[PDB]
A paper describes a structure:
However, our experiments using monoclinic crystals of lysozyme show that the method can also be applied to low-symmetry systems. Prior to mounting, 1 µm 75% glycerol was added to the crystallization drop for cryoprotection. Diffraction data were collected on ESRF beamline ID23-1 using an X-ray beam of 10 µm in diameter with a flux of 3.5 × 1010 photons s−1. However, this is not the result of a combination of low-symmetry crystals lying in preferred orientations in the sample holder. Nevertheless, that the merged data set for monoclinic lysozyme obtained following HCA is somewhat incomplete suggests, for some low-symmetry systems at least, that data collection from samples in two loops with different orientations in the X-ray beam may be required to ensure a fully complete, high-quality data set.
Here, an automated procedure is described to identify the positions of many cryocooled crystals mounted on the same sample holder, to rapidly predict and rank their relative diffraction strengths and to collect partial X-ray diffraction data sets from as many of the crystals as desired. Subsequent hierarchical cluster analysis then allows the best combination of partial data sets, optimizing the quality of the final data set obtained. To demonstrate the general applicability of the workflow described here, we have applied it to various systems and scenarios in which many crystals of the same type are mounted on the same cryocooled sample holder. In all of the cases presented our workflow has yielded data sets that are fit for purpose.
Residue numbers in the entry: 1 to 129
Write the structure that this text describes.
């Protein structure tokens, strides 16, 4: 699934990302835009042999099992395929663990590079939430 901006904002808000750990909803929508272009099936390989999965580009090195990163952790206790689902619940629940893991949203390099410090409230412009 490729979400619309406000469609994704609504789904994220329903699943509790709005202000989660003090990060307003626009942060999360912005992170998704630049991590995945709102595409639930986005995957990008990392140079170390892990892969980033789904709408929030979660890393299989630590967070999910894809069988392809032998000896890696599965801290969300889910297969990585689940993070490519058209429904975002698994990705959100895992993202909540990631954002609480000591670095806030700095975990997402695209958020750091393109959202951090900007007017992230712009990302929910015109949304009916």
């Amino acid at each position: 699934k490729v979400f619309g901006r406000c469609e994704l904002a609504a789904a994220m808000k329903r699943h509790g990302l709005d202000n989660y750990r003090g990060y307003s909803l626009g942060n999360w929508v912005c992170a998704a835009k630049f991590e995945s272009n709102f595409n639930t099936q986005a995957t990008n390989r990392n140079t170390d042999g892990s892969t980033d999965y789904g709408i929030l580009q979660i890393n299989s090195r630590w967070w999910c099992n894809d069988g392809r990163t032998p000896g890696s952790r599965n801290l969300c206790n889910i297969p990585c395929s689940a993070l490519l689902s058209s429904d975002i619940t698994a990705s959100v629940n895992c993202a909540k663990k990631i954002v609480s893991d000591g670095n806030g949203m700095n975990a997402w390099v695209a958020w750091r590079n393109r959202c951090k410090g900007t007017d992230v409230q712009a990302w929910i412009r015109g949304c009916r939430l």
